[PDB]
Amino acid sequence: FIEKSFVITDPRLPDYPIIFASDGFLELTEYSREEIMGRNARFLQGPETDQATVQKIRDAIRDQRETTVQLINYTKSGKKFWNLLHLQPVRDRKGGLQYFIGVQLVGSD
Ligand SMILES: Cc1cc2nc3c(=O)[nH]c(=O)nc-3n(C[C@H](O)[C@H](O)[C@H](O)COP(=O)(O)O)c2cc1C
């Protein structure tokens, strides 16, 4: 889904850096690709983000399972939005986790 907001992260590098951010992710978050690359996606969180939901994401990553959650995130300018976030593990030919894809399916409402 090239036309959506998504990032691809590399679990095989320290702290799951973003290695690709789609045009839609730039549009949603207001950050530049240069401001995003190599970061962990948690930079989108802020004071109003529910930690119980952050824990659910941790668990999904630990267990390498697909999941969907809703949580408050923040654009570069500090604007709050509800993010319906879908996380999808991608495995290589040998069954080993290779990427995690995160789609911000809906940004607010
Ligand atoms: C592919 C992928 C995409 C993610 N996208 C978001 C996102 O859009 N917003 C967000 O708040 N966290 C997102 N996260 C979650 C954080 O990167 C992080 O995994 C989460 O905050 C739990 O880890 P922590 O407790 O170490 O922060 C994403 C994670 C992955 C692997």
Curated annotation (Swiss-Prot):
Inactivation phenotype: Plants lacking both PHOT1 and PHOT2 have curled downward leaves missing color changes and lower petiole angles in response to weak or strong blue light (BL). Impaired proton H(+) pumping associated with altered increased ATP hydrolysis and absence of binding between 14-3-3 protein and H(+)-ATPase (e.g. AHA1 and AHA2) in response to BL in guard cells of plants missing PHOT1 and PHOT2.
Record domain PAC: where: 65-109
Tissue: Expressed in leaves, stems and flowers, and to a lower extent in roots. Present in guard cells (at protein level).
Residue ranges of domain PAS in the record: 1-64
Residues annotated to bind FMN 2: 40, 42, 45, 58, 73, 83, 85, 104
Induction or repression: Light fluence rate-dependent induction, independent of light quality.
Modified residues (S-4a-FMN cysteine): 41
Note: Undergoes a photocycle characterized by fluorescence and absorption changes induced by blue light. Half-time of photoproduct formation is 11 seconds and 15 seconds for dark regeneration.
Role description: Protein kinase that acts as a blue light photoreceptor in a signal-transduction pathway for photo-induced movements. Triggers the phosphorylation of AHA1 and AHA2 C-terminal penultimate Thr in guard cells to activate them and induce stomatal opening in response to blue light (BL). Also phosphorylates BLUS1, a kinase involved in stomatal opening. Mediates calcium spiking of extra- and intracellular origins in response to blue light. Involved in hypocotyl phototropism.
Annotated protein name in UniProt: Phototropin-2
Section covered of the full-length record: 386 to 494 of 915
